[PDB]
Amino acid sequence: MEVIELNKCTSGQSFEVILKPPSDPSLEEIQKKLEAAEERRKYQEAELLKHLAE
Amino acid sequence: MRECISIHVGQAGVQIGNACWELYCLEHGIQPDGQMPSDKTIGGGDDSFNTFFSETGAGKHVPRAVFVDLEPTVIDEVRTGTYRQLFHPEQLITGKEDAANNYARGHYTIGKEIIDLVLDRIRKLADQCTGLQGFLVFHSFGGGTGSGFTSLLMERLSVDYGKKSKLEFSIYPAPQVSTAVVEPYNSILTTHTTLEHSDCAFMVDNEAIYDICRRNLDIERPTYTNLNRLISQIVSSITASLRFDGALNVDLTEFQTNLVPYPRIHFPLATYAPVISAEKAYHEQLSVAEITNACFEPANQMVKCDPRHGKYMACCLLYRGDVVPKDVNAAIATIKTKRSIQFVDWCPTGFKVGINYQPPTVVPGGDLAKVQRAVCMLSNTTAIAEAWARLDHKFDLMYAKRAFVHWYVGEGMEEGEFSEAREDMAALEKDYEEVGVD
Amino acid sequence: MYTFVVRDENSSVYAEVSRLLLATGQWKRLRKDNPRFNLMLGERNRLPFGRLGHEPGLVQLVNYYRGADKLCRKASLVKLIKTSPELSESCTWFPESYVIYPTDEREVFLAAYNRRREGREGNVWIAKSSAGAGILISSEASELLDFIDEQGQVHVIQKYLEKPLLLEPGHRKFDIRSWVLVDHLYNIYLYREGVLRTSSEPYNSANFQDKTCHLTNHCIQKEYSKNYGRYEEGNEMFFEEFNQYLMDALNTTLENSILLQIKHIIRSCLMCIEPAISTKHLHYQSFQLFGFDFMVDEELKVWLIEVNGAPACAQKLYAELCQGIVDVAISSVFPLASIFIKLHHHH
Amino acid sequence: MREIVHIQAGQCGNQIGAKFWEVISDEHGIDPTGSYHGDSDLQLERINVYYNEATGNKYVPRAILVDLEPGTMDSVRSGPFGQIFRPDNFVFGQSGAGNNWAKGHYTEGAELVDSVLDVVRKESESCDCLQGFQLTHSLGGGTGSGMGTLLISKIREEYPDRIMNTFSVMPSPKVSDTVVEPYNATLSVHQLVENTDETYCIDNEALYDICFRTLKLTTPTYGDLNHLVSATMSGVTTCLRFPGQLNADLRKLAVNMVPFPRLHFFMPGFAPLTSRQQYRALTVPELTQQMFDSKNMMAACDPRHGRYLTVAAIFRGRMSMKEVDEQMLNVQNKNSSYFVEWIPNNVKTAVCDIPPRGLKMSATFIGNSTAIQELFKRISEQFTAMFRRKAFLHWYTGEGMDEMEFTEAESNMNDLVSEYQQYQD
Numbered sequence A: 001m002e003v004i005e006l007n008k009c010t011s012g013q014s015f016e017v018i019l020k021p022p023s024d025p026s027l028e029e030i031q032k033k034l035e036a037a038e039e040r041r042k043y044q045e046a047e048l049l050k051h052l053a054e
Numbered sequence B: 001m002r003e004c005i006s007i008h009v010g011q012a013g014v015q016i017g018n019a020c021w022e023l024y025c026l027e028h029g030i031q032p033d034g035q036m037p038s039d040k041t042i043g044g045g046d047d048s049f050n051t052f053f054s055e056t057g058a059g060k061h062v063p064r065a066v067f068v069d070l071e072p073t074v075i076d077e078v079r080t081g082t083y084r085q086l087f088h089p090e091q092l093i094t095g096k097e098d099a100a101n102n103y104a105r106g107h108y109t110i111g112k113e114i115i116d117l118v119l120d121r122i123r124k125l126a127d128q129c130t131g132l133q134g135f136l137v138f139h140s141f142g143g144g145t146g147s148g149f150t151s152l153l154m155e156r157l158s159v160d161y162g163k164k165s166k167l168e169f170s171i172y173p174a175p176q177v178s179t180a181v182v183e184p185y186n187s188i189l190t191t192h193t194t195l196e197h198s199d200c201a202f203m204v205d206n207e208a209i210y211d212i213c214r215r216n217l218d219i220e221r222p223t224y225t226n227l228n229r230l231i232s233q234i235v236s237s238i239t240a241s242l243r244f245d246g247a248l249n250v251d252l253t254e255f256q257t258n259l260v261p262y263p264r265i266h267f268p269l270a271t272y273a274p275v276i277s278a279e280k281a282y283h284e285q286l287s288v289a290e291i292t293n294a295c296f297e298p299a300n301q302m303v304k305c306d307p308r309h310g311k312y313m314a315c316c317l318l319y320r321g322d323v324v325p326k327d328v329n330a331a332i333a334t335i336k337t338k339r340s341i342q343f344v345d346w347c348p349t350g351f352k353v354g355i356n357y358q359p360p361t362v363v364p365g366g367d368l369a370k371v372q373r374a375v376c377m378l379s380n381t382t383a384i385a386e387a388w389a390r391l392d393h394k395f396d397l398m399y400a401k402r403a404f405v406h407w408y409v410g411e412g413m414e415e416g417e418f419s420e421a422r423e424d425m426a427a428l429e430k431d432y433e434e435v436g437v438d
Numbered sequence C: 001m002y003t004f005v006v007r008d009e010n011s012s013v014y015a016e017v018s019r020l021l022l023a024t025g026q027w028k029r030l031r032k033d034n035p036r037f038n039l040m041l042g043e044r045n046r047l048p049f050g051r052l053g054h055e056p057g058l059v060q061l062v063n064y065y066r067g068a069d070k071l072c073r074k075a076s077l078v079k080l081i082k083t084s085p086e087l088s089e090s091c092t093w094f095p096e097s098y099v100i101y102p103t104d105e106r107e108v109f110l111a112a113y114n115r116r117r118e119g120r121e122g123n124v125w126i127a128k129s130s131a132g133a134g135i136l137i138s139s140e141a142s143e144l145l146d147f148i149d150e151q152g153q154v155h156v157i158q159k160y161l162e163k164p165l166l167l168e169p170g171h172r173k174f175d176i177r178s179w180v181l182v183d184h185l186y187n188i189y190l191y192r193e194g195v196l197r198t199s200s201e202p203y204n205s206a207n208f209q210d211k212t213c214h215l216t217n218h219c220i221q222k223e224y225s226k227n228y229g230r231y232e233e234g235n236e237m238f239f240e241e242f243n244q245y246l247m248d249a250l251n252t253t254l255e256n257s258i259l260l261q262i263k264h265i266i267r268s269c270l271m272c273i274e275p276a277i278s279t280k281h282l283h284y285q286s287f288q289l290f291g292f293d294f295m296v297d298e299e300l301k302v303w304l305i306e307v308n309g310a311p312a313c314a315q316k317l318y319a320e321l322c323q324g325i326v327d328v329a330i331s332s333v334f335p336l337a338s339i340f341i342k343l344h345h346h347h
Numbered sequence D: 001m002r003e004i005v006h007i008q009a010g011q012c013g014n015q016i017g018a019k020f021w022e023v024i025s026d027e028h029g030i031d032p033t034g035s036y037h038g039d040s041d042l043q044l045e046r047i048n049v050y051y052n053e054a055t056g057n058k059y060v061p062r063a064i065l066v067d068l069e070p071g072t073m074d075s076v077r078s079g080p081f082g083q084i085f086r087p088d089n090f091v092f093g094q095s096g097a098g099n100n101w102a103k104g105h106y107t108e109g110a111e112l113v114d115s116v117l118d119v120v121r122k123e124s125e126s127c128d129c130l131q132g133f134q135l136t137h138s139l140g141g142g143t144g145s146g147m148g149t150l151l152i153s154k155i156r157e158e159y160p161d162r163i164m165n166t167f168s169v170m171p172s173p174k175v176s177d178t179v180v181e182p183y184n185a186t187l188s189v190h191q192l193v194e195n196t197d198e199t200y201c202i203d204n205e206a207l208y209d210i211c212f213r214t215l216k217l218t219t220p221t222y223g224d225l226n227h228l229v230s231a232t233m234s235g236v237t238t239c240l241r242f243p244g245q246l247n248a249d250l251r252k253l254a255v256n257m258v259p260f261p262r263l264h265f266f267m268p269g270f271a272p273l274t275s276r277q278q279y280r281a282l283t284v285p286e287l288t289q290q291m292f293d294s295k296n297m298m299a300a301c302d303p304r305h306g307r308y309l310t311v312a313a314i315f316r317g318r319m320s321m322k323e324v325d326e327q328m329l330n331v332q333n334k335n336s337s338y339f340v341e342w343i344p345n346n347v348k349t350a351v352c353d354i355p356p357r358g359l360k361m362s363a364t365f366i367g368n369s370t371a372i373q374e375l376f377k378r379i380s381e382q383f384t385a386m387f388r389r390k391a392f393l394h395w396y397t398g399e400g401m402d403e404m405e406f407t408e409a410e411s412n413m414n415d416l417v418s419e420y421q422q423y424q425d
């Protein structure tokens, strides 16, 4: 049961009590993911219109 | 002094954000018009509260906050609400149609077209900082925007602000206050793509807030206002060290250092006490030992689980009010001899403690009663993985039938992203078991 | 109309409980994966406790205590007794035991072993484990340890009771099985009815190679014993006959000489882990049936052998007990439109 | 500002549409001349969803009345709220469709569809943000059936990313106009499986039985049937016309109710349904027992024959929101064998303070139940009964159709039934 690093100031205080010792994707890569999804949306919209055209 | 930028995304993030800033102003003596009498350095200064507020020549204190929602009806509340004068229009960003509880829609479809706009409005705030620490990102797991657009925002923030820290405050889906069925999908999609971009996340389970409101406040059917005023107290206790003088958790980096020794296991459990009803005749003021002891009762945790059957990796005690280190240790000693507190063998069995003498501020006319002392315990338990198990299980029930998947594929997401996300959560559940079980 | 689900088809006990619930016409059984249940008769291994208590407006109850394995595992029980101050290492009703991996208590076991061998004391130990049907009795430490290395699971070596209480006629060993029910409020109900699983072979202290006269398990006596069913039907004597015998032979009663100690042991063990398994302030409720196994020496001192987490029952007592399980454990949480002994204690 | 463009086609579609605009106009405080005369701000909070705002604070419905004969639309224009509809929104021909799907879809209808889309385009171009479209029509006639599905198909072409929702009246021999109704209904159902996101299935037989057995009406009229559709249409559209987060817009509702794209046919339900013992207050338990009772449902299908994929309930009035949750959770927990276990929490409840006219409190039910296959089976059986003999086909081949198109539609609907079945197990 030890208290360490007791820091006191006008508005409060903080300390530590030990009870026992121990024992990314780039900007280009994101535009490609975003544009890939946009493309698949465009493809599924083309098939819809092509189906309505028929 | 270093600045922190708060980002609020979706209905949940925006409404919770509105509640916190209402509370920050009451705490720092700020008025709805932005004036702060106690601030004697007019038009500038590097006080602790300046990490969350900027200052104009007229003496206004402006939150370092951004509100992003793909639909205007909620942010419109802020524009005309009580604190309309605090934020300038650039800080409030809205689309015209929401994501429809569809992660793919908020991340791919609508997110793609509004991402650059948000990043810019954030760049504007960053340009007013002399030493930005990072961001605080509020959002919901279930919402199409809260989930889908946030993960994209996190990915870009890691690109534009690599060395900056990012904390989350995420709302875990609960059926009692939700009307969306696909929230398990969104929760796991967003946790997969956001995991590597978040240094520390505080999950709040609406089921936990709901029960606390029904049990401790005696609200028969709690509203979002009830849930948010309580959530903002917990948030205030967590951000208090960034806004007030102190030596514990004085920057966003110290949150990872003190609470997340393993990067993927960065979901500390939050426990708060006391929560007393303001309608009560008059409550007996609880002691340091009693409120501290309450921190190990499951009934006041932000996520329902059983820490008795996990292992702690870290533990912070944040007190506000009349508390002294003498009474803290006295209570902690008494709790070790009664409670079941097993730490991981590669971590010390210790408690970092912070005390702020200013007791919790309560919104006038709110549901919470004024108390002379309160505490919020931040402990990293493997038991919070129960929240993943539940969520992951609901995901498996629907996905086995491919239910609702067509809505996501229709927005441009590949079906493989579902399994790739689930395979990651399966990996996440294993890391928790490898650390906490024998 | 309450609802329950079954997830352990191999449980004779709760299979009879599921039959009684349906008989009342006020309980409805659902599919094993339907989450909208009031009661769960859960699986023995890896019961998903994390998913209990998260159904709006459903009070959910389960027939197992998360963490009770600490008491129902061979090596776990030894670790619990030596470390828990409420039981202390000097516990007087549990045989000297040691956890031996194939931390580890090898050198501590040999130390106490060497002390007995030097002091002319009876040095007969028994090695066992949880992964058994796999037991070995020997007075040589070399054989015990060598037997454990041949396997691959944790074992326990505890002192063998060389002076057991021998029933007459027959000169035969035995063990007492007590069924104990713990409800959601952590009340401890001892079933008034117990059973002695007796050995049909005369006890022989000069031959630990034939394990039929030393092991009182019901399966071993019915397979390797040739006098099965001679003295009592199925090598099962019940408390009525056992009490009459103690009065004719020893001039005492089963209550005074044994039951008081059994009730004490049951309390001490369960009260110990109450903080770790209590569901008092939890989002779900738990109850569980336990099977305590005791030994009795010729001095009339009771010894705790093990604790079963999913115990079966004696055929003649399934009705009374299972019905009692519904009265105190299930219908107390879900009331409908004593055979137990309450062991009071301080919560 | 999330606007909806309403379309009503054919005789049935227009008589029901007229009553719908009559019912909600009263709820939002709009009078027959379009002048607001309410007393609550909740009335106008979402009024732009269905009403355009013109000069003089006049609210004009965003409805487009369509037909191939003038007869019915002349009744609407002479009806109680006829003067409230935009005069330009009346698009009609003179030939009629003679209860012939092929006429409304391929011949007479095609001649008129272009001018309808000109009005649709006119209304969309003034919407700040268009949610989607809702169409009212019968499937057993010619105009609302043949031309109605023609509009949906052409509206989807021009607005492929907008929600298309319809209230569809299914024909029943008990309430029949002609014997060809099975033919027309079968041909439309295939159009709907393809080109709608949500279709409220309204069976005239259920509406009849309810009027005879429950409402105790000796001889029910089409007007009496339409009173039930009015009340139901007002109920389902409450979440859209008043403030709320549950099923707020049309897309969120479709996302939470439609797990699979082709299984988007709902069973509506309403409570109470009382005969003239009509002033008695109705408690929350009674609203829930009746709301889930098959007798209170309008698809003529016993839900106990199938399983609910998802359920949406809306309670209107000043009541115990706590008592609502307790009763709704009682029905799920006491009949869980009728809810798919592989969709967690598939029963969402919404509450609204404003009750319908002349009622303390009411409840509307929207179920995506696999029992709906019983409805499509009836149609498919009546269809095949005549089609195996090629009876009455000449009316259709004489309009350019080939028998092959009938065989295809038959197969498409039988597939739709086989799809509901595999999810019911």
Ligand SMILES: Nc1nc2c(ncn2[C@@H]2O[C@H](COP(=O)(O)OP(=O)(O)OP(=O)(O)O)[C@@H](O)[C@H]2O)c(=O)[nH]1
Pocket (backbone or CB within 6 Å): B009, B010, B011, B012, B013, B015, B016, B070, B098, B099, B100, B101, B102, B106, B140, B141, B142, B143, B144, B145, B146, B147, B171, B172, B173, B174, B177, B178, B179, B180, B183, B206, B209, B224, B227, B228, B231
């Ligand atoms: N605690 C709390 N939870 C909220 C609040 N608002 C919404 N939620 C929860 O958030 C989840 C839905 O997410 P939303 O925020 O509504 O969705 P969104 O971010 O607006 O994204 P969209 O789909 O485009 O609307 C549900 O589980 C709600 O229970 C709030 O104000 N407080």
Ligand SMILES: Nc1ncnc2c1ncn2[C@@H]1O[C@H](COP(=O)(O)OP(=O)(O)CP(=O)(O)O)[C@@H](O)[C@H]1O
Pocket (backbone or CB within 6 Å): C095, C126, C128, C132, C133, C158, C159, C160, C161, C162, C173, C174, C175, C214, C215, C216, C217, C293, C295, C305, C306, C308
């Ligand atoms: N220390 C000891 N001294 C004397 N006998 C012992 C003993 N340990 C075990 N036994 C004998 O072993 C039998 C029980 O063995 P144990 O309970 O350890 O294995 P097990 O768990 O597979 C049987 P069960 O679970 O049914 O009680 C008893 O009948 C007892 O006679």
Ligand SMILES: Nc1nc2c(ncn2[C@@H]2O[C@H](COP(=O)(O)OP(=O)(O)O)[C@@H](O)[C@H]2O)c(=O)[nH]1
Pocket (backbone or CB within 6 Å): D009, D010, D011, D012, D013, D015, D016, D097, D098, D099, D100, D138, D139, D140, D141, D142, D143, D144, D145, D169, D170, D171, D172, D175, D176, D177, D181, D204, D207, D222, D223, D225, D226, D229
């Ligand atoms: N519920 C209801 N059904 C109707 C009404 N009018 C016609 N129907 C039904 O609709 C079918 C006839 O279609 P109808 O609308 O008259 O054909 P259309 O004018 O060419 O579109 C038959 O099944 C009728 O029973 C009505 O006012 N209410």
Ligand SMILES: [Ca+2]
Pocket (backbone or CB within 6 Å): B039, B040, B041, B042, B043, B044, B045, B046, B047, B055
């Ligand atoms: Ca200043």
Ligand SMILES: [Ca+2]
Pocket (backbone or CB within 6 Å): B158, B162, B196, B197
């Ligand atoms: Ca980073």
Ligand SMILES: [Ca+2]
Pocket (backbone or CB within 6 Å): D111
């Ligand atoms: Ca012509």
Ligand SMILES: [Mg+2]
Pocket (backbone or CB within 6 Å): B010, B011, B071, B098
């Ligand atoms: Mg929203």
Ligand SMILES: [Mg+2]
Pocket (backbone or CB within 6 Å): C306, C307, C308
């Ligand atoms: Mg055993």
Ligand SMILES: [Mg+2]
Pocket (backbone or CB within 6 Å): D011, D012, D141, D177
């Ligand atoms: Mg007609």
